[PDB]
């Protein structure tokens, strides 16, 4: 399990792997981890499948209620706040949840990081999972704000390839989503072995 997100001049990049093991045994290879909340929100899956899926579905329900009551699209910080308040009411009972929230705002780009430990914080770069440190390393090599589009594509794709190359609990297809001002857009779904042939030399 390794996800990342980083915002820059042209919006937000979100990428993830698709391997979801069970202990020492891999369940599937094509687990779509980036949960599509809205046509303007993207949630992820970071520790636990059921908790992330359920609570993001409940947050999507709540956001749709908010929009249908105010005729005005929700902000990003409000969604992260609602998620943190709903998650906090079962603290200590054994919820594992480390998801990320991405979207476009009235302010523009918005990037928050909500834990089951409740560490709701803003920021510019984040990475969750067991092999997240590998993504931090190669990303904070290649990070800037003034990057191009295909450069950011190459950064995220190389990052997830290096992460799945070193970590054992990560793998499968590399999804790649791109958040714009109007709405998010899926870029590509790339396999590991294709990246190994392409980037091995």
């Amino acid at each position: 399990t390794t996800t990342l997100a980083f915002k820059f001049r042209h919006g937000v990049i979100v990428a993830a792997d698709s391997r979801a093991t069970a202990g020492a045994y891999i369940a599937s290879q094509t687990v779509k981890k980036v949960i599509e909340i809205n046509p303007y929100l993207l949630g992820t899956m970071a520790g636990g499948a059921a908790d992330c899926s359920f609570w993001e579905r409940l947050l999507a329900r709540q956001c749709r209620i908010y929009e249908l009551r105010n005729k005005e699209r929700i902000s990003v910080a409000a969604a992260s706040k609602l998620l943190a308040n709903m998650v906090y009411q079962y603290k200590g009972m054994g919820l594992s949840m480390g998801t990320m929230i991405c979207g476009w705002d009235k302010r523009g780009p918005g990037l928050y990081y909500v834990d089951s430990e409740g560490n709701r914080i803003s920021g510019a770069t984040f990475s969750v999972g067991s092999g997240s440190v590998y993504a931090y390393g190669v990303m904070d090599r290649g990070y800037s704000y003034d990057l191009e589009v295909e450069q950011a594509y190459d950064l995220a794709r190389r990052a997830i390839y290096q992460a799945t190359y070193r970590d054992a609990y990560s793998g499968g297809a590399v999804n790649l989503y791109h958040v714009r001002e109007d709405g998010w857009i899926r870029v590509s779904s790339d396999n590991v072995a294709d990246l190994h042939e392409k980037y091995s030399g």
Binding site: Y25, A27, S28, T30, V31, K32, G48, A49, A50, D51, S53, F54, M93, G94
Partner: protein, 213 residues
């Protein structure tokens, strides 16, 4: 002391075809180092296009089956139409999370047809996630069956092997071969096989024996 769970075992298979969903399961129900019976089918026919399988702890399987049947009748008797497949999957996910903090110790596989009339296999976990995949093997003999389905259905890890769409009788010989080969090495598998096939014309069942040990 009193332990609330026990491992009953079992093996449930599903294969999503172009226009068919085959669900098969052994009918051995055991406990520890004994045999309780040699007839207990994990499959259940909900609607004309939906078959659910439930393995793991048996009492939770019975309770969950009856609650799902009740809610099926609630949707039908409220809204003049049957549920879809994904609606039943979503509802089951809501149920499995609605007892999150006292979980069902149950693996679940729902096969069936969608509204386009195509096959769809919805897997599960004990806590309540799901996803639309092409093939799953649940229970104790999961690992004895997943790589062979990766070899045959997915045509994975092969070279110069083209992709043929999976026909019906080929899938039948696949299911028979994988249950014989898995019943050779497992201790929680055998004595019968109840194969359920969902087509655009109804539900078929089929009883194929196995080895008697």
């Amino acid at each position: 002391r009193f332990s609330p769970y026990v491992f009953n075992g079992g093996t449930i298979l599903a294969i999503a075809g172009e226009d068919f969903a085959i669900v098969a399961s052994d009918t051995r129900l055991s406990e520890g180092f004994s045999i309780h019976t040699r007839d207990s089918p994990k499959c259940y026919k909900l609607t004309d296009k939906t078959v659910i399988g439930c393995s793991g702890f048996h009492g939770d399987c019975l309770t969950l089956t009856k609650i799902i049947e009740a809610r099926l009748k609630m949707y039908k008797h409220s809204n003049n139409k049957a549920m879809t497949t994904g609606a039943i999957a979503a509802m089951l996910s809501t149920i499995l999370y609605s007892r999150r903090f006292f979980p069902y110790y149950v693996y679940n596989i729902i096969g069936g047809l969608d509204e386009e009339g195509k096959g769809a296999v919805y897997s599960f976990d004990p806590v309540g996630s799901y996803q639309r995949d092409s093939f799953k093997a649940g229970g104790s003999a999961s690992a004895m069956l997943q790589p062979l389905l990766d070899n045959q259905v997915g045509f994975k890890n092969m070279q110069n092997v083209e992709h043929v769409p999976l026909s019906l009788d080929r899938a039948m010989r696949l299911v028979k071969d994988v249950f014989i080969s898995a019943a050779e090495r497992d201790v929680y598998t055998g004595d019968a096989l109840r194969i359920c096939i969902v087509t655009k014309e109804g539900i078929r069942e089929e009883t194929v024996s196995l080895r008697k040990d």
